[PDB]
């Protein structure tokens, strides 16, 4: 038992990180088959940062302008192409450590495990959720651009995120693996603030389901409520609306616990109104929206 914030084993991704250097700018690339993927702002100098012309900055580049390095071995670049905000660099050698993979685009509220690297060498791994304003709250320093966020199902690694920049607020932004940014962002060094952040409502119910499995019971409410009445109170405290799909996805946990999802909503209504009264849930004095229904089931059911 117990409940912990938990990431995916980064073994299959550890064999896909490489170093990429155009000029003296350095970051990370994703080596899959004979292709390396990385952000496009690697072709920028320390100066072209306000409004950089990535198109005009890439025409001047040739294949021998990209130093791709996999450990102590450099990969000869034979072709490069830009696609949205990422650069794809073809190499003469296919990665012998490539696993089964898909390029997915996640929705707000879904989780993925980030393997943060610097200079193509993995540094650590943590779990993050895509905030409603399409940012993440990770932990990135300079040289982190190129790190990937992924989910592993079975033996397949669904790549879903690649890191790019950090906002003035301190939250982290980036693209998917086809370069399309997550949110209204651009790869320029301008004053940018995301959208207004809401609480991922379904995950909080999912996180309260993990708490009842684990012994916590004091926040439970005998009497039910409705999907119409809860969504009325949900937005009162800046919570995403609760769709009938959300209820359906919580089906496994509504079964393991014997508490209807709408019964769990009434308990969330009481918790929102009164607070915790200095009591703790799963070791947290704040309602956590960072665990999807899948993270809860995978950690609770055998």
């Amino acid at each position: 038992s117990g409940f912990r914030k938990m990431a995916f084993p980064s073994g299959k991704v550890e064999g896909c990180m490489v170093q990429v250097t155009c000029g003296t700018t350095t970051l990370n690339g994703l080596w899959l088959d004979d292709v390396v993927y990385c952000p496009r702002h690697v072709i920028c100098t320390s100066e072209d940062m306000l409004n950089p012309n990535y198109e005009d900055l890439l025409i001047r580049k040739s294949n021998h302008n990209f130093l791709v390095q996999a450990g102590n071995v450099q990969l000869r670049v034979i072709g490069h192409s830009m696609q949205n905000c990422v650069l794809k660099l073809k190499v003469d050698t296919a990665n012998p450590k490539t696993p089964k993979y898909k390029f997915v685009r996640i929705q707000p509220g879904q989780t993925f495990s980030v393997l943060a690297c610097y200079n193509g060498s993995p540094s650590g791994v943590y779990q993050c959720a895509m905030r409603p304003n399409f940012t993440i709250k990770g932990s990135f320093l300079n040289g982190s651009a190129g790190s990937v966020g992924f989910n592993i199902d079975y033996d397949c690694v669904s790549f879903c995120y690649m890191h790019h920049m950090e906002l003035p607020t301190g939250v982290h932004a980036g693209t998917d693996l086809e370069g399309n940014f997550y949110g209204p962002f651009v790869d320029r060094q301008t004053a940018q603030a995301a959208g207004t952040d809401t609480t991922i409502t379904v995950n909080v119910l999912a996180w309260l389901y993990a708490a009842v499995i684990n012994g916590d019971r004091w926040f439970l409410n005998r009497f039910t409520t409705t999907l119409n009445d809860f969504n009325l109170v949900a937005m009162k405290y800046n919570y995403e609306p609760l769709t009938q799909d959300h209820v359906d996805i919580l089906g496994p946990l509504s079964a393991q616990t014997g508490i209807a999802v709408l019964d769990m909503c009434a308990s969330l209504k009481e918790l929102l109104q009164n607070g915790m009264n200095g009591r703790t849930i799963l070791g947290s004095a704040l309602l956590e929206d960072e665990f999807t229904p899948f993270d809860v089931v995978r950690q609770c059911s055998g």
């Binding site: 350095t26 920028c44 610097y118 790019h164 950090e166 060094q189 301008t190 004053a191 940018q192």
Partner: peptide
């Protein structure tokens, strides 16, 4: 006050 691209420049 502005966004910081997090490659390693210098």
């Amino acid at each position: 006050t502005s966004v910081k691209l997090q490659a390693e420049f210098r």
